[PDB]
């Protein structure tokens, strides 16, 4: 019977603005959508899609609402089907080693859901790409845009696409007739980092009656 009355919902933190995407971003880049001061509407997450694969790395999935944190770093990427479990801190792989890696101390949670129809089409959408190699393993939370042809030999090919001189992007081979292991899911992640700030992003609270 305790009174928990609070002011109005204020301004929705725009998330579905990101999740309800017309076209998501390739892993080659990141949406990196910064969400500023508002009420962290994380609560509304179950109504994404059937078989929403969710699993966190430091915050209670359900009691996340009350834990107000400082800021949020939100980015998205569609990924090759089976590679969902590649997105995990301290787990090496293909994408996790040359596309995007989560630091071990990443307190946030990982959200993934199947895409299928929206992404995959019978004609084939080769728009999305992914990295093929690099001079060295990327530092975590870093963005690579260079389209430089690799130097696998003792000789810099400069601008000729040659033996041991490779191009760093191949497309997401996405045909709807592909298997569940190959079906494109949509994997996003939300950073819950701590800083020196008044924690301008908190979950909303319910209210009682008069």
């Amino acid at each position, epitope marked *: 019977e305790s009174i928990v009355r609070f002011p109005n919902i204020t301004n929705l933190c725009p998330f579905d603005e990101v999740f309800n995407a017309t076209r998501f971003a390739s892993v080659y880049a990141w949406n990196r959508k910064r969400i500023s001061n508002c009420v962290a509407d994380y609560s509304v997450l179950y109504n994404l899609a059937p078989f929403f694969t969710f699993k966190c790395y430091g915050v209670s999935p359900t009691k996340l609402n009350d834990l107000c944190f400082t800021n949020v770093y939100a980015d998205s990427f569609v990924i090759r089907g089976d590679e969902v479990r590649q997105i995990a801190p301290g787990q090496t792989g293909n994408i996790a080693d040359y596309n995007y890696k989560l630091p071990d101390d990443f307190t946030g949670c990982v959200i993934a859901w199947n895409s299928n129809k929206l992404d995959s089409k019978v004609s084939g959408n080769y728009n999305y790409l992914y990295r093929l190699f690099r*001079k060295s393993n990327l530092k975590p939370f870093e963005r690579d845009i260079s389209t430089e042809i690799y130097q*696998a*030999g*003792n*000789k810099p090919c400069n601008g000729v696409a*040659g033996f*041991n001189c*490779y191009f760093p992007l191949r497309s997401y081979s996405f045909r709807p007739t592909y298997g569940v292991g190959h079906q494109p899911y949509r994997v996003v992640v939300l950073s819950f980092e701590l800083l020196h700030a008044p924690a301008t992003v908190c979950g909303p609270k319910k209210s009682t009656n008069l």
Partner: antibody
Amino acid sequence: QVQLVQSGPEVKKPGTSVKVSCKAPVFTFSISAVQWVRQARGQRLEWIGWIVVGSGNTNYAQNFQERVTITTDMSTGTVYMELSGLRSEDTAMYYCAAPYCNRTTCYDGFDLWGQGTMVTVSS
Amino acid sequence: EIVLTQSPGTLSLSPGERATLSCRASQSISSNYLAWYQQKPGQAPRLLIYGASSRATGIPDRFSGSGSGTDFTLSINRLEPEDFAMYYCQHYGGLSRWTFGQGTKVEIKR
């Protein structure tokens, strides 16, 4: 160096399509490259193609381009080569030749080569 | 189109004596995308040249052939039993098709 295991020889009828298996023992072709080359007894190493295995981008020598196909098998790290429209004189040795690829650099020029597979079209 | 023709392959040569293997081509090509391979019969060839001379791992200064543009050669300073083998020059430039050479019969002068 290390030796790449290669599939056993067989004999086939004319007009068939042959799949010959070449797989490195402990060398996954992460960003490596390879493809096959053919000789008959005492003749030239007739080139076939090359693929960036990590990629899948192909080149088919514009000679048997309509009858030669290649795909890889990353899961077990095997490269493949199908030669359709097998006619008489294709009876010849097959070699799969790859360069060593350290994940950061490859020694320019294919050095790690396969065992050698015999293929006979004749009856 | 690339037609790279090799030297008068049929080399009847006495031990220790010098040899030269020209790999004249039909077109101008960078002097790095060509290598030489040595084959004992009944087994695949082996890598000898990496770029310019670039004597291969294990293979000493004995094989230091050169060339540029359309001219490319391989030189042998001495002769050892392993030297008596098929020699192959091959082009591997760019995404373009890799050209191969006919061969060279390095044998003993009798």
